[PDB]
Amino acid sequence: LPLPEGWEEARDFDGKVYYIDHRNRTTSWIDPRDRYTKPLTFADCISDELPLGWEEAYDPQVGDYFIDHNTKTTQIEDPRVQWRREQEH
Amino acid sequence: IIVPSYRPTPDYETVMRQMK
Ligand SMILES: [Cl-]
Ligand SMILES: [Cl-]
Ligand SMILES: [Cl-]
Ligand SMILES: [Cl-]
Ligand SMILES: [Cl-]
Ligand SMILES: [Cl-]
Ligand SMILES: [Cl-]
Ligand SMILES: [Cl-]
Ligand SMILES: [Mg+2]
16 A cells, blocks of 8 residues: 555655645654554554554664654653563563 | 653644745
């Protein structure tokens, strides 16, 4: 699947990828195709994958960190690992 | 330091205007 009609890929000032919906005049960090392809929760994830709405990013001062677009937050803790230690208990 | 704060997507109209 390619981008649905009306959607255009673009790059932010530092090259970070986002998506433009011209039909609704809005922008999003999330690829609309993720709404089909991404696993729904951390339970649905295998290997190193991230559920719908989560992004890993890099910061020169702190290293890798995580972005939850579902809640518009960022965190240093690895949510895949949090979820493992939670279901171990 | 500590983790970067959340970054909002760029504004649609702003993006359309900045293509000049
Ligand atoms: Cl539409
Ligand atoms: Cl927007
Ligand atoms: Cl978003
Ligand atoms: Cl769509
Ligand atoms: Cl979950
Ligand atoms: Cl920051
Ligand atoms: Cl402008
Ligand atoms: Cl303006
Ligand atoms: Mg106008």
